[PDB]
Design a protein around this ligand. Sequence first.
Ligand SMILES: CC(C)(COP(=O)(O)OP(=O)(O)OC[C@H]1O[C@@H](n2cnc3c(N)ncnc32)[C@H](O)[C@@H]1OP(=O)(O)O)[C@@H](O)C(=O)NCCC(=O)NCCS
Ligand SMILES: CC(C)(COP(=O)(O)OP(=O)(O)OC[C@H]1O[C@@H](n2cnc3c(N)ncnc32)[C@H](O)[C@@H]1OP(=O)(O)O)[C@@H](O)C(=O)NCCC(=O)NCCS
Ligand SMILES: CC(C)(COP(=O)(O)OP(=O)(O)OC[C@H]1O[C@@H](n2cnc3c(N)ncnc32)[C@H](O)[C@@H]1OP(=O)(O)O)[C@@H](O)C(=O)NCCC(=O)NCCS
Ligand SMILES: CC(C)(COP(=O)(O)OP(=O)(O)OC[C@H]1O[C@@H](n2cnc3c(N)ncnc32)[C@H](O)[C@@H]1OP(=O)(O)O)[C@@H](O)C(=O)NCCC(=O)NCCS
Lengths: 390, 390, 388, 390
Amino acid sequence: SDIVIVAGARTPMGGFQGSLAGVSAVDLGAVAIREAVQRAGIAAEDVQEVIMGCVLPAGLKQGPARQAALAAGLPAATGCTTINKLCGSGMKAVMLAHDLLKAGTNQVMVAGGMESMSNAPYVLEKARSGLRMGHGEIKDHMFLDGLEDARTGRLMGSFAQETADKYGVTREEMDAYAIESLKRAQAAIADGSLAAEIVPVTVTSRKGESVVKDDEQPLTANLEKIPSLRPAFRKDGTITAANASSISDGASALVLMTAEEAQRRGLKPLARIVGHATQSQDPSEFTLAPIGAMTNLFARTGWSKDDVDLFEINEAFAMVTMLAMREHGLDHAKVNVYGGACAQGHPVGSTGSRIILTLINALRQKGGKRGVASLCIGGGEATAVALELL
Amino acid sequence: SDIVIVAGARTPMGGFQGSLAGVSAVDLGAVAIREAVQRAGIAAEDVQEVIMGCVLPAGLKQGPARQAALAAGLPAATGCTTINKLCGSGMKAVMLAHDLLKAGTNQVMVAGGMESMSNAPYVLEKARSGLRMGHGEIKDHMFLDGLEDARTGRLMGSFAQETADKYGVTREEMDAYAIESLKRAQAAIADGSLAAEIVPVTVTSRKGESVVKDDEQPLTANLEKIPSLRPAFRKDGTITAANASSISDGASALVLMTAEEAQRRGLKPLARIVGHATQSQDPSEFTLAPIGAMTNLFARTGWSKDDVDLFEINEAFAMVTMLAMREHGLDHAKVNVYGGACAQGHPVGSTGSRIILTLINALRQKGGKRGVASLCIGGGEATAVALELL
Amino acid sequence: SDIVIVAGARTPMGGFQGSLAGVSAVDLGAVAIREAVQRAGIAAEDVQEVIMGCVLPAGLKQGPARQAALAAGLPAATGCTTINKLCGSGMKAVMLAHDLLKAGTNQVMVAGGMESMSNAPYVLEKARSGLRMGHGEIKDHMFLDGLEDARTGRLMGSFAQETADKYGVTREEMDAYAIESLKRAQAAIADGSLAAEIVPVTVTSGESVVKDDEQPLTANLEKIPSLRPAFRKDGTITAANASSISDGASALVLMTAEEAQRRGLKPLARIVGHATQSQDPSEFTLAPIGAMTNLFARTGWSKDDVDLFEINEAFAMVTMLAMREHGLDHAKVNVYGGACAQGHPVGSTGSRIILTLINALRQKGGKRGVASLCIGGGEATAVALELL
Amino acid sequence: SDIVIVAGARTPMGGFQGSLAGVSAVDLGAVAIREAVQRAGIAAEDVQEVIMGCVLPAGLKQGPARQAALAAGLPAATGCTTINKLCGSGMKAVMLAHDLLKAGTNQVMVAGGMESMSNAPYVLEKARSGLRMGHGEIKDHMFLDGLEDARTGRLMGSFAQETADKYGVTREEMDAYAIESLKRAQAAIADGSLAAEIVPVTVTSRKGESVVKDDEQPLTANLEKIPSLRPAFRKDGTITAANASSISDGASALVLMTAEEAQRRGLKPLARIVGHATQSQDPSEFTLAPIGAMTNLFARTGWSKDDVDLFEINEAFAMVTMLAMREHGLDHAKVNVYGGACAQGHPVGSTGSRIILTLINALRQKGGKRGVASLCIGGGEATAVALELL
Ligand SMILES: CC(C)(COP(=O)(O)OP(=O)(O)OC[C@H]1O[C@@H](n2cnc3c(N)ncnc32)[C@H](O)[C@@H]1OP(=O)(O)O)[C@@H](O)C(=O)NCCC(=O)NCCS
Ligand SMILES: CC(C)(COP(=O)(O)OP(=O)(O)OC[C@H]1O[C@@H](n2cnc3c(N)ncnc32)[C@H](O)[C@@H]1OP(=O)(O)O)[C@@H](O)C(=O)NCCC(=O)NCCS
Ligand SMILES: CC(C)(COP(=O)(O)OP(=O)(O)OC[C@H]1O[C@@H](n2cnc3c(N)ncnc32)[C@H](O)[C@@H]1OP(=O)(O)O)[C@@H](O)C(=O)NCCC(=O)NCCS
Ligand SMILES: CC(C)(COP(=O)(O)OP(=O)(O)OC[C@H]1O[C@@H](n2cnc3c(N)ncnc32)[C@H](O)[C@@H]1OP(=O)(O)O)[C@@H](O)C(=O)NCCC(=O)NCCS
C-alpha cells in the first residue's frame, strides 16, 4: 500500500513570549488540523486516527492531541495519541501514521506537531512530599524536560558548542550560514512563498484582536548586529542566538491516506512517502545523527544526494545543517531555500512535520520533485523522511 | 507476517508514596525492559525500536523512554519513543509495535509503559510571565494532565460516579465485585500465580537495601473495611477507594517480533497477537468504551465471546468491568481471574501492556488458548487486543 | 525632656512595578536614613538606635532595619529594631522613638519606615510538610499579611466600600475629593513644594534620578468620573479615590531637646504629644476620628489651634469622614495632596506625612500641625507637632 | 517610674514539625497572653497596649500581634504592634514595654513573642515580574529572613563554627556543656520545676484532643548520641545538633506595669526590671555580642557578676554561653540552671522573653534575689535585662 500526503497546513512560528503567547498549544494544534482537513477535500467525520508530537504537555490538561482534535472540529469517534520523540515528535507522528496505513489499521489519518514554549509551565519536584528545610530549585519545564540532556543536564546548545569546535566550525563560517537564512526567510516572507504552507491566526488580547500570517522571528531581527552578538552557551563560545534555532510557538498537520483511499475519493494528494529511517547514537552526538539518518534513508529507498532536488534539514544549530551538508556533500542552494529555524523558530514538537510540508511546498514553487527532510533529536537521534510530488 | 509476543515483564505496583517511590519511572521502565529482553533469550543489541507509554512526563527529564532503554542496557543504536494515549498508552505502545512489525520497519521491538504517580511534580502556570498581583494556583501535574477531563476539569472518578448512577450500579453491587478482586488478588500472591510475569525491583530503605516482588495494595488492603469506606467523587456517592483503582507506580515491557523472526532465531514465542481495535466517543462516557472496543475487536477478528477462554478488562472502577461484562454477557469466573486495578493498583502509563501480560500468564497457568484484553481511556476511548498461546 | 524632629528625608513614591522597582525597600530606607542624618547636620556615629516600619519583610533577608542602617552608612554599633503596626508602621517607629528618648534609653534616634510593595514576594504554606495530592494556592504576601483582614480574608477597600455606604458616601462626593487631591499634587510638583522633604533616588538599568512622586505624572484628571470600581461590581471606590500601591521610604532624626541644643542644631519641629485608637477591624476607616479625639484629650488642644492637618488618604473617604466628624476645613488638610494621588508605600507613610506636614506648616506659614492615618485590625495613630 | 513584671506564662517549646506544628504562631501567643493576664489578677480590658516579637511573619496574616491579642480575649480597644530584633525580638518587646511605661504612655502593657518555624512558608522572589526563562530558586523564609546573615547568606551556625575555631573551643568542650544542659532539662521536666512558668497547650490531629505540657527536645534527646553526631555546619566541624539551639515553636508573654499601678490594684509583683542594655557589632561577631551586652548592663545598672545570683544566657550554640562564661568569669552552676536552647529549643521570636521567665521562676525555686538574662542577636547584636525579685 503506497502512502500519500493529501493536504498540509501549519501556524506562523511565534518567538518566545511573542505573537502567539496568548494561544495554548492545543488551540494552535486545532488551527493546523482544522485547515489540514478542509484543504484535503475530506470531512472531519472521515478522519479515523490523529497522532500529534508534543514535547512539553505540562499544563496542557488531559490528552493534549484529544483536545486539539475536538477543537479542529473532529468527531469524538476519531481516536487521538500524543507522542514525544523530542524534536522529531512531528516526523515520528508521520512515520507512525505511514506504517499504520501500510498495516491496514486505518485508511485516513492526520499526523502533525504542536508547541507553545511560551506557556510551558514551571515544576516543583519535592513540594508533593515536602521540602522540609533549606532553599530549593524551581525548574523551567521547557529546559528540564526539553532542552537539557537527562544524564548531564547540559543544554542541547552546550553539546552543539563541543561538537562544533571538534569539527572546526569558526564564528565566521557559522555566521555565513545564519546570515543567508535571515535573507531567505525574508525573501520568502516577501515573495509570499510561505502563505501557501501557512494558515493565519486570530489572537485576542487587551489591544483588541489581531491576524498573524507571517513568521515572527525574522521580522524582529537585525542582520548587521550578527558578528557582535555575545556567545550563548560558553563565555568564549562560537555559538550565539543568530546561528542557534529560536525558542518559538506553533503547530502543523498533514492528512495521510493510502494511494487507493485517495484514488477512490477522487482526491489528488500533494505527495507520496517513499520511505523513512531512524538514526540513533550517543546523546553527545545528537548534532550529527542527521548524517546517518539520511545515510539509512538513501540506503532503504535506493536514493543518493544526486537524485534529490531539495532537502529540509532543521537548523537546530547552523552547524547541524552545515556538517550534514559538509559530510553528505550537499549544495547550499538546495537546502532550506526559504530559510531554516535560526530565522523562523523551532516549536520543538511541531518542526518535524512543518519541514515535511515546507519541503513538499518547495518542490512545488521550484517545480522540483524528489525531496528529503531530516532533523536531529536531543537524546542523540535523527529521523529522515523521503517523499515525491504527485 | 504473523506477529508474536516473545516474552514480557512487569514490576510490582506500589501504592501512592510507598514501596516503589524512591525509584523513578525511567528507572522502573529499565528493570522491566531488561528482564523482558533477557527472558526472550535475545541480546540488547538485537532490539531495533522501543515504544514506552507515560501519561506524566513532568520532572522525568528529556526522553523518558530514551532513559528507560539506555539505563536497562539497550545500546544507543536503538530508537526510543514516548507515547501518551492516557491510561491506554501501554496497550497502544504494543498496538503501534504490532503495526510497525507488520509494516516491515522493524523485526525486533520492545513496547510497554512506565509511571511513578508518587513522583509526579506540581506546576505554576504564570510564574514565567508574571502573577502581577493577587493569589495564584499551584497545580498537581497528575490531576491537571492525567486524572481530570480537559473540557470540564472533572476527575475520571466523577464521570464514573454519574454513569454508575445512570446505569443504576448500587453501592452493594460494586463492593461484591471488589470484595472478589482482592480475594483473587491475595490468592495469586499467596500461591505465586504472578511470579512468572513479575521482575522484582530493588529499593533503599533506612535499613539498607530490600527487594519488592509482590504488589503493594493487596497487602495494605483490609477486606472487612470495603463495606464502610467513604465515597471518593461525590459526598453520597457509590464509588470508594475499594471499587476505584488506586494511584500506583510501576512499569511493564513486552518483546514483540514477526513469527519468522522468533523461528529464524530458534525461539518459542509465548503467544500471538490475533488483532486489536479502538473505540472513541464523548469524553464523559469513557467507562462504556471498552464494550465498543471489544465489539470492534470481535468484528475485525471474527471471534465471538464464546471463542474466548480468558478476559483482561482493566478495573479503573469496578463499574467499568461490571458493565463491559453485563452488555457482552461475560462470565465473572473467566474475567480478571487473578484480580485487577481495584485490588492490585493502576500505574496509568503501564496498566495497558501489563494486562496483555497477566492474560498470557493466566492462559498458560489455567490452561486456556484464546484471550481478550481491553481498557477504558480518559478522553472517551478504549483499546482492545486479542491473542492466542502457541 | 521635650522631643525635637531635627531633620528628615523621604524618597519619591513610585508606582506598583514602577520607577523604584529597581531598588529594594532596604536600599530606599538607606537613601532616606543617610539623607536624614546629613540634614540633621550630625555624623552617622552620633545616631544611637534606628527603628523602621516594615509591613512586608519577606525576602528582604535578616533584620531589614539593621541592613538599611548599615547601607545608609551608620556604624555596626547602631541598635536596629524592625517593626510592623501595618500602615501606621512609620508613625509608630516615631512614637517608639518619642518614648525611648523620653525614658533616658537614648539621645539621638532615627525612625521612619520603608516599603517595596513592588518586590513583595509570593508564599506557599503546605510545601514544607508536603502538598501530597490536589491543587494549591500560591499567596501574594502583599494581600496575605498587608491588605486582607485576618478574620475574613476581605481586602481593606472592601471594608471601606462597606463603611462609605453605611455612612452614605456617593461616587460623586468621593471623585470630587480625588480631583482636588490630584490637582494639589500636580500643583506641588510644578511649584517644587516637595523638593525640601524629597531626596532624589538614582536607579541604574544606564542610570536616572527619580525626584517627583510618579502617580501624579501618569494620572489623567479627565478620567476620574470614568474609572470602574475596584472592590464590588456596584462600587463607589476606584483607582482614583483609593490609595495606590507604592515603592518609597521615609526617615526622621528625633532628639531630646537637651541633645538638640547641646549640638548647636536648629530643629524643624517639637513633638507635643501622640495617641493610638484601637477598635473593630471593620471600622478601620473610622479609627482616625478616635485617634485625634484621644490626641485632643491628651494635648489639651481643639481642631481650633491646628493650622494644617495631614490625615493620610488611605481611601478618599477616610479623610472625608474625619473632615465631617471633627469639623475640619478641606483648605487646612492634605494641602499638597495625599495618598490617593502621590502614593502609599504602606510601612513608610506613617513618617512621611509627619515630614510633609512640617514642610507645609513652614512654606504655608503655620505653627501647630496634626498627623493621623488609619490602620488594619481596627486602629489608628495620631501625632501632634509644633514648629520652632 | 519603676517597672514590675506581675506575671508571665510560656507554651512548651515544640520541635521542628513536632508536637505544636498544628497550632499557628498566633494561637500560641494567644494561649500565652491569656494565661499571662489570668495569672496577673487583672481583666483583659485593663491591658492598654501589646508588643509581640515575631521574626518569621510571612503567611501569619495581617497584624500577627493584633490577631493574638484578640484571640487571647483582649478587647479591640487594647491596641497591638509586632516587632523584629531577630533572636532577641522577645526581650526587645519587654524593653520597649519598660520604656513606654517609664515615659507615661500606658499603665498596663503585655510584652512577649511567638514563632512557629514549623509553619514558616516558602517564598518565590521572581514570581510577580516573571521568571522569563531558566531555573529559579524557592527560598526558605526561616533561612532567608531568619537564620542567614544578609551580607553573606552564611548560617548563624557557619559564623558560630568559625568563631569557635578562632577562640579555640574543642568539640569535646561543647559536648561536655551540651551533656550538662540536657541532664538539667531532663531532671527539670521530671521533678516538675518548669510547671509554674509553663502553660499547657491543647491541640487536635486525627484521634482527637492532646495536652502538650513538656518541652519536646529533652524527651526525644539521647545523651549517648551527643559525641557520635555528625558536624552540623562545616565539613569536619565541631558544632553538632546537640550543641546548637534546636529549630522550635512556642510563645511567651509577660504582664508589665509601673510599680505604683501594680500597688493601686493591690498586686504582689514577681520582680522589678532594674535595667536593660543593648550591644551591637559587626554581624560575624554576633556570637560574642552577649559579652558587650552584660558589660554595658553592669555599666548602666551599677551591678557586677558577684551581685548576679543566676544568669539566663540563651545558648544559641553551646559556645555562646561558654565564651560568655569564660570572659565574665561565670560558673555553669549559676547559669541556665534548668538547661537551655540546645536541650529545650529556640523559638527565635520567643526565647528573649521566655528566658526572663525561667530566670525569675529559677530565682523563686532555688533561693536568690538578682538575675541577668542576655541572648545573641543575628546581625552582630545582643540585648540583656537585669531584674530583682520582690
Ligand atoms: C540562543 C538563545 C540562548 C538566545 O536566547 P535569547 O537571549 O532569548 O535571544 P534573543 O534572540 O531573544 O535575543 C538575542 C538577540 O539575538 C538577535 N537575533 C536572534 N536571532 C537572530 C538572527 N537569526 N539574526 C540576527 N539576530 C538575531 C535578536 O534580535 C536579539 O538582539 P538584541 O539582544 O540586540 O535585542 C536561546 O534561543 C536558546 O536557548 N536556544 C534554543 C535552542 C535549543 O537549545 N533547542 C533546540 C533543540 S535541538
Ligand atoms: C479513590 C481514591 C481517591 C482513594 O485514595 P485515598 O482515599 O486518597 O487513599 P487510600 O487508597 O490510601 O485510602 C482509601 C482507604 O481504602 C483502602 N483500600 C484501597 N483499596 C482497597 C481495597 N481494594 N479493599 C479494601 N480497602 C482498600 C486504603 O488502603 C485506605 O484504607 P484507610 O482509609 O483505612 O487508610 C484514589 O484511589 C483515586 O483517586 N483513584 C484514581 C482513579 C483514577 O483516576 N484512575 C484512572 C482511571 S482511567
Ligand atoms: C491597586 C489599586 C490602586 C487599583 O489600581 P489597579 O487596578 O492596579 O490599576 P491602576 O493603578 O493602573 O489604576 C487604573 C487607572 O486609573 C488611573 N488612576 C489611578 N489613580 C488615579 C488618580 N488619582 N487620578 C487619575 N487617574 C488615576 C491609573 O493611572 C490608571 O489609568 P490607566 O488604566 O488609563 O493607565 C487599588 O485596588 C488599591 O488601592 N489596592 C490596594 C488597597 C490599599 O491601598 N490598601 C491600603 C490602604 S489602608
Ligand atoms: C543544626 C540543625 C540545623 C540540625 O538540624 P537536624 O539535624 O535536622 O536536627 P535533628 O534534631 O534531627 O538533629 C539530628 C540528631 O541530633 C539529635 N539531637 C539534637 N539535639 C540533641 C540533644 N540535645 N541531645 C541529644 N541528641 C540531640 C536528634 O535527636 C537527632 O537524632 P536522630 O538522628 O536520632 O533523629 C538544628 O539543630 C538547628 O537548630 N540549627 C539552627 C540553629 C538556630 O536556631 N539558629 C539561631 C541561633 S542564633
